[PDB]
Amino acid sequence: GIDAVYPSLVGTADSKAEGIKNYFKLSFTLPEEQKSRTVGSEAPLKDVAQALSSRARYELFTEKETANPAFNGEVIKRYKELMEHGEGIADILRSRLAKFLNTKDVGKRFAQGTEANRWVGGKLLNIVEQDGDTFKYNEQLLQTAVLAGLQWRLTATSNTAIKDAKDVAAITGIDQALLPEGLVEQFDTGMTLTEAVSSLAQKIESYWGLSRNPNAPLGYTKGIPTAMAAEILAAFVESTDVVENIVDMSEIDPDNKKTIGLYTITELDSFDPINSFPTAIEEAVLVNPTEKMFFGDDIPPVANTQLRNPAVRNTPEQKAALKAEQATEFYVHTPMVQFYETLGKDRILELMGAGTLNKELLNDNHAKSLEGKNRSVEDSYNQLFSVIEQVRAQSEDISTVPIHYAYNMTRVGRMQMLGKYNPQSAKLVREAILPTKATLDLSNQNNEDFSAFQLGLAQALDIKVHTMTREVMSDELTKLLEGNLKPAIDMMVEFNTTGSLPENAVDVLNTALGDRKSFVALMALMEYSRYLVAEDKSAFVTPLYVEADGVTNGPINAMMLMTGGLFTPDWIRNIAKGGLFIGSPNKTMNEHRSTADNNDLYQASTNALMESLGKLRSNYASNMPIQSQIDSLLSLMDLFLPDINLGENGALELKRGIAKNPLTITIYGSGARGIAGKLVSSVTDAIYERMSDVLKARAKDPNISAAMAMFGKQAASEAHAEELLARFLKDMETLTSTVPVKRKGVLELQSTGTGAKGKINPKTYTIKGEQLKALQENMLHFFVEPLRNGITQTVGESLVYSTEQLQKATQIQSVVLEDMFKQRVQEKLAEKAKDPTWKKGDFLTQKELNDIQASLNNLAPMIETGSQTFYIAGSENAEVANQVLATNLDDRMRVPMSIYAPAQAGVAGIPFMTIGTGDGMMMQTLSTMKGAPKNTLKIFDGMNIGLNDITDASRKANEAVYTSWQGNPIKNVYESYAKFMKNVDFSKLSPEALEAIGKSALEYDQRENATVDDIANAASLIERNLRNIALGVDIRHKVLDKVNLSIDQMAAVGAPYQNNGKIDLSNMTPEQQADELNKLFREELEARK
DNA sequence: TCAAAAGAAGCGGAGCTTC
């Protein structure tokens, strides 16, 4: 079969033969059902080029009757030029093989018997054929691989993952808090070797259309395609389709020896016809294209497995979730597209980005951040227009072309729309392609329709819609439309009348919006002005939406899901700030915020921080030098952060804002040091920006006061702008030269001998490493520490205990799985080494890996809820194989061998379960529950709803929130950890893993003098802890369900979900409610007893 | 801290080494 297709390859397809053995045929086999239309073709480049030569030829080749209408003349012409370029890549490749065969007589040595086809750099020799006194590529495999390479070149960038700080830190080996400025931007805008080759390899093997033989070594099944990828990547470097950049980390940190390769794909012109249809190749080659747009009733198929987690199948309920979301039709809203278009890319960059930095006369570091904001917008813009260019071809009226999007479930159970730039992920696109729409009767402003319309406009305009009633927001929206926004409204009216914009459109918009500016705000100004000129106001069609938005969702979900003790009154008040109201029939978040408590969970945190902060000062009341450090750190923040306000007499006031991100990531398991670095970065980002202001201040006057140029705004006078300049230089002084150190459980100031000193240069200015670290330590001990205590005091110690036990449990388990998998890989390799057909370079077969994985089932690597499946340890590390998989023909581009294997979890257990059983389970529920809202856009912790169904959809959302609150993540972990605890043997563990386990289950002291039996007893103690917590959470949930509850967590609209609790707890203080709930609690315990 | 990983290259044909 396979030999009949490739009968001329070099070698014998028998692992037991003595001479050259051909590992291509030994590792692959023809599939049952055709996957690629090139297998069997003696020249895929020519055949595919012919197939692309005309719509008629295309249709026949793909055995389809009609072809994408986007496949017209211009596109056809661009694809002809691209095919000719494919021949260029092919020629480069053929020439590289020849050079490889000549150097060090590899070719001659290979023909004489040297098994060079097994070297990390010669696996491609498995696809060559004998030709005279040398070898040559098999044209079918080569060309097909080139076709794969062309598709990848056209759409790889758009499919890349977004790299945050964590990623960059892991890649570069530089602490996340110390990354220079545009470093993250530089690495997010390029691909690492692994990222490039991996996606390229996947594409190549896919186009080859064969199947992996389960009994073939991974070194070949994965190696041959990866080796082909490396060569194609090298070829693209030679052709300049791809730019390679070797980043030397020794400059950005003299101690780092890592030199990292970065790969960027030369972008095509935004107006290139290929963009209107960049999947023509993919769609001709693959019978089941996994890269295309979905129009009409061409619905996306349902992913069978969790994203990048083949070991986990999407449960039946999750599959139903995906199906519902993928069936939703999205539509282009022409007015917005025409607006973006009339404004133009350049002006949207000015308006929503940094618009033209050409005046490269602004702080060097600030300039790198501004450049990043521009990129995100620009790429976002071109991607939106490439999409409408294809849509446009589908029909005469682009507003009526239905659009479907593929989705998939992630590790933490979220339904992520696939693709970097889409409605779910890109704000710019979100306002252009919507699933929402409604026909409203706005003829009377007393109608409910108008009231929904106002809600939509107000929320888009940044009015805190969930903090007031419809009525009150109705007045606030009006005062704004007729106020600061009127000039922008009038302009939009003209735009929706003649199609033109003034020359000062950016200024009119920027001035009318102020900090309310955003893409959704542009939609609001657009929709209101459309309504104004509308002929028939009684039937206004708009995609404008209202989002049922979760209030402090993550922290509230955690409190609700993992608090496991008796009920507390602080807890009852605090949980009310998240939508759970006890004894208040039909109460809404709007009434709660305006009538009972105007402070949300972020504020409560900030207020607890302020108290814990004042407390810190007392413990050092006399220590003048410490008081001054705190005061200086507080002074620096007040100088640049809006959330801090030191006032005249010293009154310290804080906004809920400074606790937003920290409260959130502390729920995702973040450490204190990490939070501190985030805050520092905020400060520095603002300083760098103020440095640009100064530059721009003296360019506007060469004599402006240094102080006046930097604080002319914040100040009210001269000597005043001098007081601020005095605080700055002094704050940067004490903060970079002196840092707090915790000794004997007490704080002590220590000099760094690396303080900031010298004449400030507003353009070169930069807060370096040793100075960033200093700010970091001050921020850590004088702000974050008290903030962390405040957070804990707010969410509850009980919840913190649960997350600790959860982390510990999931960690310990991840360790064993990891150590065991690694060991059993070492045992098998130990056998293979005794086999004459095997070689040190080959790894194990997929079968041998599937067996090793199976040998771990009894350790319960999976966590089940009944509707969701989690595999916390799952990952793709290079640690298991610990070896190169393949290199290019120049002995470079050495790609490490990655294997799907369990790894240490760290704190990952927390985010996985809180997100998974929290917002993950909720949205899943919301899209599959009886009467599931239709035509919405779900973004994890919020849902966009068309103006016509905001009431019922919001209520269903709150109901979904309620059923997700019936979850018990700890219980699920208990179930898994308990099975694990009865099959694990801590003596089979290396001292390495045995030590990590001790860290989680044993208190620092007992670690050294700890036997296997010691950590086994402790680990066993953790089982009981979880068992107890799970039992508590379960009682609370049942008890809480017997009382009358009103839930409005997905606030905005004011449609709370009523649980019909029979027991009435109205007319009671939280204290009374706690005692009553505990009576039902103790009572329920007895029941079980 | 979750969402996905992750250094390059001589000599020799793996994996130690130096930057």
Q: What is the 3-state secondary structure (H, E, C) of A11-38?
A: CECCCCCCCCECHHHHHEECCCCCCECC
Q: Which residues contact A81 (CB under 8 A, 6 or more apart)?
A: none
Tokens of A699: 């360019």
Q: What is the H or E stretch that residue A987 is in? A: none
- Closest nucleotide C1' to the C-alpha of A263: B6
Strand B proximity: list residues 88-127 of A with CB under 7 Å.
Answer: 104, 106, 116, 118-122
Residue ranges of the binding site of A for Mg(2+): 549, 941
Structure tokens at A852: 């090793």
How far from the centroid of its chain's Cα atoms is residue A400's Cα? 31
Joined tokens for residue A9: 């390859």
Q: Chain A, 634-693: which CBs lie within 7 Å of strand B?
A: 661, 665, 668-671, 674-675, 678
Q: Which of A959, A924, A923 is nearest to A943 (CA)?
A: A923
Containing A744, the helix (H) or strand (E) segment is none
Which H, E and C letters describe A345-391, residue by residue?
A: HHHHHHHHCCCCCCCCCCCHHHHHHHHHHHHHHHHHHHHHHHHHHHH
CA A808 to C1' B16 (Å) is: 38
CA of A211 to C1' of B11 (A): 36
For residue A2 the two structure tokens come to 């396979």
A722-761 in b/e burial notation, b at 16+ Cβ within 10 A? bebbebbeebbebbbbbbbeeeeeebeeeebeebbeeeee
Q: Where are the alpha helices (DSSP H) in A581-623?
A: 589-591, 601-618
Angstrom CA distances, A244 to A264, A398, A876, A962, stand at: 7, 40, 25, 51
CA A748 to centroid of chain Cα atoms: 39
Alpha-carbon distance of A487 to A474, in angstroms, equals 20
Q: Give phi and psi for A601, each to the nearest 5.
A: -60, -30
CA distance linking residue A15 with residue A3, whole number of Å: 15
The nucleotide minimizing the C1' distance to residue A308's CA is: B4
> Given CA atoms A694, A698, A701, A706 in this order, what sign does their dihedral have?
positive
Q: How many CB atoms lie within 10 A of CB A717?
A: 10
**d(Cα A658, Cα A603) in Å, to the nearest integer?**
9
Closest of A23, A14, A31 to residue A221, by C-alpha? A23
Check: CB of residue A488 under 8 Å from CB of residue A512: yes
Give the residue carrying structure tokens 């990048």: A308
Asked whether the CA dihedral A838, A841, A842, A848 is positive or negative, the reply is positive
Question: In angstroms, rounded to a whole number, what is the distance separating the alpha carbons of residues A159 and A156?
Answer: 5
- Taking a C-beta distance cutoff of 8 angstroms, is the pair A291, A279 a contact? yes
Nucleotide nearest to A104 (CA to C1'): B12
Distance A871 CA to B2 C1' (A): 13
With b meaning 16 or more CB within 10 Å and e meaning fewer, what string describes A244-260?
Answer: beebebeeebeeeeeeb
Task: Judge whether A516 and A461 are in contact, CB under 8 Å.
Answer: yes
Give the N- to C-terminal CA distance of chain A in Å, as an integer.
67
Q: Given the structure tokens 């980005």, which residue do they identify?
A: A353
> Side chain identity at A467, as an amino acid letter?
T
| SS3 assignment, position A242 | strand
Protein-contacted positions of strand B (CB under 7 Å): 1-15, 19
Nearest protein residue, CA measured to C1' of B10: A891
Which nucleotide has the least CA–C1' distance to A162? B3
Q: Are A306 and A313 in contact (CB under 8 A)?
A: yes
Rounded to an integer, what distance in angstroms lies between the CA atom of residue A628 and that of residue A633?
Answer: 9
CA A620 – CA A746 distance, rounded (Å): 10
DSSP one-letter string for A820-881: HHHHHHHHHHHHHTT-SS--TT---BHHHHHHHHHTTGGG---EE-SS-EE-SS--EESTTT
3-state secondary structure A996-1062: HHHHHHCCHHHHHCCCHHHHHHHHHHHHHHHHHHHHHHHHHHHHHCCECEEECCEECCCCCEECCCC
- Give me the half-sphere count of Cα atoms (radius 13 Å) on the Cβ side of residue A115: 16
Resolution in angstrom units: 2.4
d(CA A947, CA A954) in angstroms, rounded, equals 11
Run of H or E residues at A1 = none
- Which residue places its CA closest to the C1' of nucleotide B18? A257
Contact A352, A377 (CB under 8 A): yes
Q: Three-state SS string across A921-976, please?
A: HHHHHHCCCCCCCCCCEECCCEEEEECCCHHHHHHHHHHHHHHHCCCCHHHHHHHH
- Chain A 940..999 CB hits on strand B (< 7 A): none
In this complex, which residue's CA is closest to the C1' atom of nucleotide B11? A891
Show Cβ contacts of residue A978 under 8 Å, excluding neighbours closer than 6 positions.
Answer: A1023, A1027
Experimental approach: X-ray
3-class state of residue A663 by DSSP: helix
**Closest residue to B13 (CA, C1′):** A119
Give the span between the Cα atoms of A494 and A1040, in whole angstroms: 56
d(CA A906, C1' B14) / Å? 33
Query: How much of chain A is helix, strand and coil, in % rounded to 5?
Result: 55, 10, 35
DSSP line for A124-168: GGGGEEEETTEEEE-HHHHHHHHHHHHHHHHHHHHHPPPP-HHHH
The β-bridge partners of A377 are none
Phi-psi region of A891 (alpha: psi -120 to 50; beta: other; left: phi over 0): left
Q: Which residues, at least 6 apart from A574, have a Cβ–Cβ distance to it below 8 Å?
A: A559, A601, A604, A794, A795, A796
Q: How many residues does chain A have?
A: 1089
For residues A477-508, b (16+ Cβ closer than 10 Å) or e, as one string? beebbeeebeebbebbbebbeeeebeeebbeb
- Closest residue (CA) to C1' of nucleotide B3 is A410
Q: What radius of gyration do chain A's Cα atoms show?
A: 31
Among candidate residues A348, A672, A334, the one with its CA nearest the CA of residue A526: A334
Q: Which of A14, A229, A1 is nearest to A123 (CA)?
A: A229
Residues 873-912/A with CB < 7 A to strand B? 875-879, 883-884, 890-894, 896, 898, 906-908, 911-912
* CA atoms of A991 and A819, how far apart (whole Å): 10
The residue type found at A774 is A
Q: Determine contact, residues A101/A6, Cβ cutoff 8 Å.
A: no
Binding residue ranges of A: 427-430, 549-554, 660-661, 941
Q: Quickly give A232 CA vs B17 C1' distance in Å.
A: 28
Positive/negative CA dihedral, A685, A691, A695, A700: positive
Tokens of A314: 């999407």
Compute the distance between CA of residue A635 and CA of residue A643 in angstroms, rounded to an integer: 12
Q: Does residue A624 sit in helix, strand or coil? A: helix
Domain annotation for chain A: domains and CATH numbers: 1-301+873-906 (no CATH), 302-328+401-444+536-552+907-967 (3.30.70.2440), 329-400 (6.10.140.1360), 445-535 (6.10.140.1370), 553-577+1067-1089 (6.10.250.1860), 578-598+1043-1066 (3.30.750.220), 599-793 (no CATH), 794-872+968-1042 (1.20.140.110)
DSSP secondary structure string for all residues of A69-86: TT--HHHHHHHHHHHHHH
| Among A802, A765, A790, A777, residue whose Cα is nearest residue A689 | A765
Compute the distance between CA of residue A938 and CA of residue A942 in angstroms, rounded to an integer. 6
- State which residue has its Cα closest to the C1' atom of B4: A308
Rounded, the Å distance between the CA of A248 and C1' of B19 is: 10
